[PDB]
């Protein structure tokens, strides 16, 4: 539909596998949990804890 651009560069074969990487909350905020074991998509999680 409009202009493109080939991009020819080096492509050596290289290992690839995910690992755990967890997000955190900057100083001054907090992360709220839903410790309920029945969490339908939305709705009040009747037990919340901070982490």
């Amino acid at each position: 539909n409009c202009n493109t651009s080939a991009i020819t560069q080096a492509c050596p074969k290289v290992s690839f596998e995910p690992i755990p990487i967890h997000y955190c909350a900057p100083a001054g905020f907090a992360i709220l949990k839903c410790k309920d074991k029945k969490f339908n998509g939305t709705g009040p999680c009747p037990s919340v804890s901070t982490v």
Epitope: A6, T8, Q9, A10, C11
Partner: antibody
């Protein structure tokens, strides 16, 4: 299984533009990669470059880039080439080669580098 | 480029002897070479690809292979229909800006 037919010779001084056609017909055009190479009689050979048609992307030669155009028309599934800014010493026989590639429409594409088939012959008398 | 020190440069040869062309390289060239042939006043015709085995769908008397740069095209029995040139070509480099060669020019007994 697609055919390769080529063309003849033209007289122009260095600088002109000429259209040449390895008009390829006969069967499925998609499964094949296409490339060009020329040689003047008694000297080395000038390889043009490949055009990966299913993406419709080509390449060229380092010390020829700037005055060449190779096109692979998937719609008509033909081939065209437009040459410009020629030089007199380059009166050479031409050839169009190709290789069976694989199920591009299914994604498999080996992308090898040899030249399976060979063209017929095409001359560019860069002179008057 | 791949230093096609084609040995011998040109060979005026007869039918029926072990062909050994040496067009070696200067840089690491693993498994990519190519040999073709062209008859005087005729079209070129492929001989060997794969750089490790004979070409496919071809009359496979030839065995064009060897050790890295020292790759020999092997037709042990030359014939009356091989008075034609022989080539060396490489297709390695990436980013893709490929290369070519000049080959060798075989001739009849002169």
């Amino acid at each position: 299984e697609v055919q390769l037919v080529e063309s003849g010779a033209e007289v122009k001084k260095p600088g002109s533009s000429v259209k040449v056609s390895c008009k390829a017909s006969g069967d499925t055009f998609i499964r094949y990669s296409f490339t060009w190479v020329r040689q003047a009689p008694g000297q080395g050979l000038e390889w043009m470059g490949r055009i990966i048609t299913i993406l419709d992307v080509a390449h060229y030669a380092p010390h020829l880039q700037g005055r060449v155009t190779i096109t692979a028309d998937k719609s008509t599934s033909t081939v065209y080439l437009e040459l410009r800014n020629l030089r007199s010493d380059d009166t050479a026989v031409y050839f169009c080669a190709g290789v069976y590639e694989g199920e591009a429409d299914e994604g498999e594409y080996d992308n090898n580098g040899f030249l399976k088939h060979w063209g017929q012959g095409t001359l560019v008398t860069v002179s008057s | 480029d791949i230093v096609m020190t084609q040995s011998p440069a040109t060979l005026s040869v007869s039918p029926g002897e072990r062909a050994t062309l040496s067009c070696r390289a200067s840089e690491s060239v693993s498994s990519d070479l190519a040999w073709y042939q062209q008859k005087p006043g005729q079209a070129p015709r492929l001989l060997i690809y794969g750089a490790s085995t004979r070409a496919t769908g071809v009359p496979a008397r030839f065995s064009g292979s060897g050790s890295g740069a020292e790759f020999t095209l092997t037709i042990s029995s030359l014939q009356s229909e091989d008075f034609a040139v022989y080539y060396c070509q490489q297709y390695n480099n990436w980013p893709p800006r490929y290369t070519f060669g000049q080959g060798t020019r075989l001739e009849i007994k002169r």
